[PDB]
Amino acid sequence: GSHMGRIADSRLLWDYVYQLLSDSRYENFIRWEDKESKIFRIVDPNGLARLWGNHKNRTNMTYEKMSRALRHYYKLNIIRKEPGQRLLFRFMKTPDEIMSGR
Numbered sequence: 001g002s003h004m005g006r007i008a009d010s011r012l013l014w015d016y017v018y019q020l021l022s023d024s025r026y027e028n029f030i031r032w033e034d035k036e037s038k039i040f041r042i043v044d045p046n047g048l049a050r051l052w053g054n055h056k057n058r059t060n061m062t063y064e065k066m067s068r069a070l071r072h073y074y075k076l077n078i079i080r081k082e083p084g085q086r087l088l089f090r091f092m093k094t095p096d097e098i099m100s101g102r
């Protein structure tokens with residue numbers, strides 16, 4: 001009974017999001033709501049999803065579909081929705097590990 005049952009790959013979404021967060025000044029679709037607490041707030045889910053769709057060259061991409069990917073991040077304790085906030089997302093796992101890990 002005990003063996004590998006769920007083998008699921010991860011997505012590069014987090015990087016493109018951070019990329020947009022770094023140059024968010026002209027986008028304003030998403031920005032940090034709290035830098036040190038690792039909390040970011042989605043201002044426009046449509047624009048964010050549109051940019052993802054544009055960059056991967058696919059038509060009709062919306063936050064509805066993106067949410068499925070976020071569900072993968074929740075269970076891995078990467079992205080959090082802090083109790084009481086639905087549009088606020090917090091990093092439980094931090095990119096610091098990647099930068100100083102590589």
